[PDB]
Amino acid sequence: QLLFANFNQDNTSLAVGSKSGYKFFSLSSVDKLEQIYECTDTEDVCIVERLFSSSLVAIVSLKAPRKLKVCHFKKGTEICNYSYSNTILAVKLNRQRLIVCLEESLYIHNIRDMKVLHTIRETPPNPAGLCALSINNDNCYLAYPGSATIGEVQVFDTINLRAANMIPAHDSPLAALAFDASGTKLATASEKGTVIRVFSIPEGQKLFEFRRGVKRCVSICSLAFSMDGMFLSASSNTETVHIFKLETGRAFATVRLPFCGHKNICSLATIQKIPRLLVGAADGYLYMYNLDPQEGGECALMKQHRLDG
Protein backbone atom coordinates (compact mmCIF):
# COMPACT_ATOMS: atom_id res chain seq x y z
CA GLN A 1 0.00 0.00 0.00
CA LEU A 2 2.64 2.50 1.11
CA LEU A 3 4.79 4.44 -1.36
CA PHE A 4 6.35 7.21 0.71
CA ALA A 5 7.14 8.12 4.30
CA ASN A 6 8.99 11.20 5.51
CA PHE A 7 9.32 13.67 8.37
CA ASN A 8 8.66 17.41 8.17
CA GLN A 9 11.30 20.07 8.77
CA ASP A 10 11.26 20.02 12.59
CA ASN A 11 10.23 16.36 13.12
CA THR A 12 6.76 17.22 14.37
CA SER A 13 4.86 15.42 11.59
CA LEU A 14 5.18 12.08 9.81
CA ALA A 15 3.73 11.79 6.29
CA VAL A 16 2.81 8.40 4.80
CA GLY A 17 1.75 8.21 1.14
CA SER A 18 -0.16 5.21 -0.20
CA LYS A 19 -2.11 4.04 -3.25
CA SER A 20 -5.37 5.38 -1.74
CA GLY A 21 -4.09 8.74 -0.48
CA TYR A 22 -1.89 9.95 2.36
CA LYS A 23 -1.90 10.54 6.12
CA PHE A 24 -0.16 12.76 8.65
CA PHE A 25 0.79 11.49 12.11
CA SER A 26 1.83 13.65 15.04
CA LEU A 27 5.10 12.79 16.80
CA SER A 28 4.40 14.28 20.24
CA SER A 29 3.87 11.07 22.23
CA VAL A 30 5.22 7.54 22.37
CA ASP A 31 2.34 5.18 23.23
CA LYS A 32 0.38 5.52 19.98
CA LEU A 33 0.97 6.81 16.46
CA GLU A 34 -1.71 9.50 16.45
CA GLN A 35 -3.25 10.21 13.06
CA ILE A 36 -4.02 13.90 12.54
CA TYR A 37 -5.13 13.86 8.91
CA GLU A 38 -6.17 11.50 6.17
CA CYS A 39 -6.81 12.23 2.49
CA THR A 40 -8.46 9.79 0.10
CA ASP A 41 -9.15 11.98 -2.96
CA THR A 42 -5.66 11.64 -4.52
CA GLU A 43 -4.37 8.26 -5.71
CA ASP A 44 -0.80 6.91 -5.82
CA VAL A 45 0.82 9.73 -3.86
CA CYS A 46 4.60 9.52 -4.32
CA ILE A 47 5.68 12.84 -2.72
CA VAL A 48 4.10 14.59 0.31
CA GLU A 49 5.95 17.61 1.67
CA ARG A 50 4.40 19.62 4.51
CA LEU A 51 5.56 23.12 5.53
CA PHE A 52 6.41 22.68 9.24
CA SER A 53 3.07 22.32 11.08
CA SER A 54 1.19 24.71 8.80
CA SER A 55 -1.66 23.70 6.50
CA LEU A 56 0.42 23.94 3.31
CA VAL A 57 1.41 20.71 1.55
CA ALA A 58 3.05 19.93 -1.79
CA ILE A 59 1.83 16.72 -3.41
CA VAL A 60 2.93 14.69 -6.43
CA SER A 61 0.89 11.72 -7.68
CA LEU A 62 2.00 8.82 -9.88
CA LYS A 63 -1.09 9.64 -11.99
CA ALA A 64 0.58 12.94 -13.00
CA PRO A 65 4.30 12.61 -12.22
CA ARG A 66 5.27 15.91 -13.88
CA LYS A 67 2.76 17.98 -11.87
CA LEU A 68 3.23 19.57 -8.46
CA LYS A 69 0.05 20.37 -6.49
CA VAL A 70 0.13 22.92 -3.64
CA CYS A 71 -2.83 22.43 -1.30
CA HIS A 72 -4.41 23.60 1.94
CA PHE A 73 -4.84 20.09 3.28
CA LYS A 74 -7.17 20.84 6.19
CA LYS A 75 -9.60 22.76 3.96
CA GLY A 76 -9.06 20.17 1.22
CA THR A 77 -8.39 22.76 -1.48
CA GLU A 78 -5.91 22.86 -4.33
CA ILE A 79 -4.31 26.30 -4.30
CA CYS A 80 -2.27 26.00 -7.48
CA ASN A 81 -0.23 23.61 -9.54
CA TYR A 82 2.77 23.62 -11.86
CA SER A 83 3.91 21.16 -14.54
CA TYR A 84 7.53 20.52 -15.51
CA SER A 85 9.11 19.04 -18.62
CA ASN A 86 10.13 15.81 -16.83
CA THR A 87 9.15 13.82 -13.75
CA ILE A 88 9.45 15.40 -10.28
CA LEU A 89 12.06 13.54 -8.23
CA ALA A 90 12.04 15.62 -5.03
CA VAL A 91 10.33 18.63 -3.45
CA LYS A 92 11.86 20.64 -0.60
CA LEU A 93 10.38 23.66 1.08
CA ASN A 94 10.94 26.24 3.80
CA ARG A 95 9.07 29.39 4.80
CA GLN A 96 10.41 31.39 1.84
CA ARG A 97 11.19 28.94 -1.00
CA LEU A 98 9.91 25.76 -2.63
CA ILE A 99 12.44 23.73 -4.66
CA VAL A 100 11.50 21.15 -7.30
CA CYS A 101 14.23 18.71 -8.34
CA LEU A 102 14.14 17.08 -11.78
CA GLU A 103 16.85 14.77 -13.07
CA GLU A 104 18.43 17.52 -15.15
CA SER A 105 17.21 20.81 -13.61
CA LEU A 106 16.07 22.54 -10.42
CA TYR A 107 13.26 25.07 -10.05
CA ILE A 108 13.31 27.64 -7.25
CA HIS A 109 9.86 29.02 -6.40
CA ASN A 110 8.83 31.89 -4.18
CA ILE A 111 6.51 30.11 -1.75
CA ARG A 112 4.54 33.33 -1.17
CA ASP A 113 3.22 33.42 -4.77
CA MET A 114 4.64 30.17 -6.30
CA LYS A 115 6.40 32.13 -9.06
CA VAL A 116 9.57 30.58 -10.46
CA LEU A 117 12.43 32.84 -9.37
CA HIS A 118 15.29 30.90 -10.91
CA THR A 119 15.88 27.74 -12.92
CA ILE A 120 19.13 25.81 -12.66
CA ARG A 121 19.57 24.16 -16.06
CA GLU A 122 21.65 21.21 -17.30
CA THR A 123 22.65 19.90 -13.90
CA PRO A 124 24.67 16.69 -13.82
CA PRO A 125 22.11 13.87 -14.00
CA ASN A 126 20.48 13.35 -10.61
CA PRO A 127 18.23 10.28 -10.97
CA ALA A 128 17.90 9.87 -7.20
CA GLY A 129 16.57 13.41 -6.72
CA LEU A 130 19.38 14.01 -4.24
CA CYS A 131 19.21 17.52 -2.76
CA ALA A 132 18.91 19.38 0.52
CA LEU A 133 17.39 22.70 1.49
CA SER A 134 18.10 24.64 4.67
CA ILE A 135 15.12 25.27 6.95
CA ASN A 136 16.69 28.50 8.25
CA ASN A 137 15.66 31.83 6.71
CA ASP A 138 18.99 33.59 7.34
CA ASN A 139 21.14 30.79 5.85
CA CYS A 140 18.81 29.73 3.03
CA TYR A 141 21.04 27.40 1.06
CA LEU A 142 20.29 24.64 -1.43
CA ALA A 143 22.74 21.75 -1.90
CA TYR A 144 22.74 19.41 -4.89
CA PRO A 145 25.28 17.24 -6.77
CA GLY A 146 27.78 19.19 -8.86
CA SER A 147 28.92 16.02 -10.67
CA ALA A 148 27.35 12.67 -11.54
CA THR A 149 30.68 10.81 -11.27
CA ILE A 150 32.55 12.67 -8.48
CA GLY A 151 31.27 13.64 -5.02
CA GLU A 152 31.11 17.41 -5.54
CA VAL A 153 28.36 19.49 -3.87
CA GLN A 154 26.99 22.70 -5.41
CA VAL A 155 25.86 25.17 -2.73
CA PHE A 156 23.34 27.76 -3.98
CA ASP A 157 21.88 30.80 -2.14
CA THR A 158 18.11 30.59 -2.78
CA ILE A 159 17.41 34.14 -1.56
CA ASN A 160 20.03 35.99 -3.60
CA LEU A 161 19.78 33.38 -6.38
CA ARG A 162 23.54 32.90 -6.74
CA ALA A 163 26.05 30.10 -6.31
CA ALA A 164 27.96 30.26 -3.02
CA ASN A 165 30.47 27.39 -3.27
CA MET A 166 31.27 24.00 -4.74
CA ILE A 167 32.60 21.47 -2.22
CA PRO A 168 34.66 18.41 -3.23
CA ALA A 169 33.05 16.19 -0.60
CA HIS A 170 33.89 12.62 -1.67
CA ASP A 171 35.72 10.85 -4.48
CA SER A 172 32.69 8.72 -5.37
CA PRO A 173 29.29 10.20 -6.31
CA LEU A 174 27.07 11.51 -3.53
CA ALA A 175 24.49 9.29 -1.85
CA ALA A 176 22.98 11.53 0.83
CA LEU A 177 22.91 15.17 1.93
CA ALA A 178 21.50 16.95 4.97
CA PHE A 179 21.62 20.48 6.41
CA ASP A 180 21.59 21.14 10.11
CA ALA A 181 18.78 23.33 11.47
CA SER A 182 21.02 26.44 11.50
CA GLY A 183 21.90 26.04 7.82
CA THR A 184 25.61 26.43 8.62
CA LYS A 185 26.61 22.73 8.47
CA LEU A 186 26.09 20.17 5.70
CA ALA A 187 26.45 16.40 6.20
CA THR A 188 27.44 14.34 3.14
CA ALA A 189 27.92 10.69 2.17
CA SER A 190 29.06 8.94 -0.98
CA GLU A 191 28.01 5.73 -2.72
CA LYS A 192 30.88 3.95 -0.95
CA GLY A 193 29.23 4.90 2.35
CA THR A 194 32.38 4.49 4.42
CA VAL A 195 32.86 8.10 5.55
CA ILE A 196 30.31 10.71 6.64
CA ARG A 197 31.66 14.25 6.36
CA VAL A 198 30.36 17.56 7.73
CA PHE A 199 31.28 20.87 6.11
CA SER A 200 30.68 24.46 7.12
CA ILE A 201 28.29 26.36 4.86
CA PRO A 202 28.96 28.43 2.82
CA GLU A 203 32.72 28.34 3.54
CA GLY A 204 33.13 24.64 2.72
CA GLN A 205 35.64 23.73 5.43
CA LYS A 206 35.62 20.09 6.53
CA LEU A 207 34.54 20.10 10.18
CA PHE A 208 33.96 16.43 10.99
CA GLU A 209 34.83 13.09 9.45
CA PHE A 210 33.06 10.00 10.80
CA ARG A 211 33.76 6.35 10.01
CA ARG A 212 30.86 3.88 10.10
CA GLY A 213 33.04 1.28 11.80
CA VAL A 214 34.65 0.68 8.41
CA LYS A 215 34.17 -2.83 7.10
CA ARG A 216 32.22 -3.16 3.86
CA CYS A 217 30.31 -0.69 1.68
CA VAL A 218 26.67 0.26 2.20
CA SER A 219 24.06 2.32 0.35
CA ILE A 220 23.41 5.24 2.71
CA CYS A 221 19.81 6.34 2.31
CA SER A 222 19.26 8.91 5.07
CA LEU A 223 21.24 11.54 7.02
CA ALA A 224 19.58 13.62 9.73
CA PHE A 225 20.68 16.14 12.36
CA SER A 226 19.10 16.62 15.74
CA MET A 227 17.47 20.03 16.09
CA ASP A 228 20.31 21.29 18.32
CA GLY A 229 22.91 20.06 15.81
CA MET A 230 24.80 17.90 18.32
CA PHE A 231 23.87 14.53 16.79
CA LEU A 232 23.86 13.16 13.25
CA SER A 233 22.28 9.84 12.26
CA ALA A 234 23.14 7.81 9.16
CA SER A 235 21.03 4.87 7.96
CA SER A 236 21.43 2.53 5.02
CA ASN A 237 20.27 -0.69 3.36
CA THR A 238 21.79 -2.62 6.30
CA GLU A 239 20.55 -3.34 9.81
CA THR A 240 22.74 -0.75 11.56
CA VAL A 241 22.04 2.95 12.09
CA HIS A 242 25.00 5.02 13.29
CA ILE A 243 24.59 8.16 15.41
CA PHE A 244 27.58 10.51 15.59
CA LYS A 245 28.14 13.23 18.18
CA LEU A 246 29.65 16.48 16.93
CA GLU A 247 32.03 17.07 19.84
CA THR A 248 35.71 17.99 19.62
CA GLY A 249 35.70 9.81 14.24
CA ARG A 250 33.39 6.92 15.14
CA ALA A 251 29.77 6.32 16.08
CA PHE A 252 28.62 7.62 19.45
CA ALA A 253 25.57 5.34 19.49
CA THR A 254 24.06 2.65 17.29
CA VAL A 255 20.73 1.01 16.72
CA ARG A 256 20.17 -2.49 15.41
CA LEU A 257 17.10 -2.71 13.15
CA PRO A 258 15.07 -5.95 12.98
CA PHE A 259 15.62 -6.15 9.18
CA CYS A 260 18.46 -5.90 6.67
CA GLY A 261 17.89 -4.25 3.29
CA HIS A 262 14.72 -2.17 3.49
CA LYS A 263 15.03 1.48 2.58
CA ASN A 264 14.27 3.69 5.52
CA ILE A 265 14.20 7.28 6.69
CA CYS A 266 15.54 8.41 10.06
CA SER A 267 15.13 11.45 12.21
CA LEU A 268 16.40 12.56 15.60
CA ALA A 269 13.54 13.97 17.65
CA THR A 270 13.04 14.86 21.31
CA ILE A 271 9.73 13.43 22.53
CA GLN A 272 8.54 14.01 26.12
CA LYS A 273 12.02 15.29 27.08
CA ILE A 274 13.83 12.17 25.78
CA PRO A 275 15.90 12.27 22.56
CA ARG A 276 14.80 9.52 20.20
CA LEU A 277 15.83 8.01 16.90
CA LEU A 278 12.77 7.54 14.69
CA VAL A 279 13.05 5.12 11.78
CA GLY A 280 10.36 4.92 9.12
CA ALA A 281 10.96 1.71 7.21
CA ALA A 282 9.73 0.17 3.97
CA ASP A 283 8.51 -2.85 5.96
CA GLY A 284 5.61 -0.63 7.05
CA TYR A 285 6.66 0.24 10.61
CA LEU A 286 7.85 3.30 12.50
CA TYR A 287 10.46 2.33 15.11
CA MET A 288 11.29 4.56 18.08
CA TYR A 289 14.60 4.14 19.94
CA ASN A 290 15.79 5.93 23.07
CA LEU A 291 19.11 7.78 22.79
CA ASP A 292 21.31 8.47 25.83
CA PRO A 293 23.02 11.75 24.83
CA GLN A 294 25.71 11.45 27.53
CA GLU A 295 26.63 7.74 27.36
CA GLY A 296 25.68 6.56 23.87
CA GLY A 297 26.12 2.88 23.12
CA GLU A 298 23.42 0.63 21.71
CA CYS A 299 19.97 2.22 21.83
CA ALA A 300 16.98 0.27 23.10
CA LEU A 301 13.71 -0.02 21.22
CA MET A 302 10.88 1.87 22.90
CA LYS A 303 7.96 1.40 20.46
CA GLN A 304 7.12 0.25 16.97
CA HIS A 305 3.95 1.41 15.22
CA ARG A 306 2.22 0.42 11.97
CA LEU A 307 2.71 3.18 9.38
CA ASP A 308 -0.82 2.55 8.09
CA GLY A 309 -2.43 3.63 11.39
Binding site: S53, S54, S55, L56, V70, C71, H72, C80, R112, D113
Partner: peptide, 21 residues
Protein backbone atom coordinates in the same frame (compact mmCIF):
# COMPACT_ATOMS: atom_id res chain seq x y z
CA UNK B 1 -6.66 40.57 -19.24
CA UNK B 2 -6.92 41.81 -15.62
CA UNK B 3 -8.52 38.49 -14.73
CA UNK B 4 -4.92 37.66 -13.77
CA UNK B 5 -5.26 40.47 -11.21
CA UNK B 6 -7.90 38.90 -8.97
CA UNK B 7 -6.59 35.33 -9.43
CA UNK B 8 -3.08 36.41 -8.38
CA UNK B 9 -4.67 38.20 -5.42
CA UNK B 10 -6.56 35.06 -4.38
CA UNK B 11 -3.44 32.93 -4.97
CA UNK B 12 -1.28 35.03 -2.64
CA UNK B 13 -4.01 35.17 0.01
CA UNK B 14 -4.53 31.40 -0.16
CA UNK B 15 -0.81 30.60 0.04
CA UNK B 16 -0.35 32.90 3.04
CA UNK B 17 -3.40 31.37 4.73
CA UNK B 18 -2.14 27.82 4.16
CA UNK B 19 1.38 28.66 5.35
CA UNK B 20 0.10 30.11 8.65
CA UNK B 21 1.62 28.22 11.56
Amino acid sequence: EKDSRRRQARLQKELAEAAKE
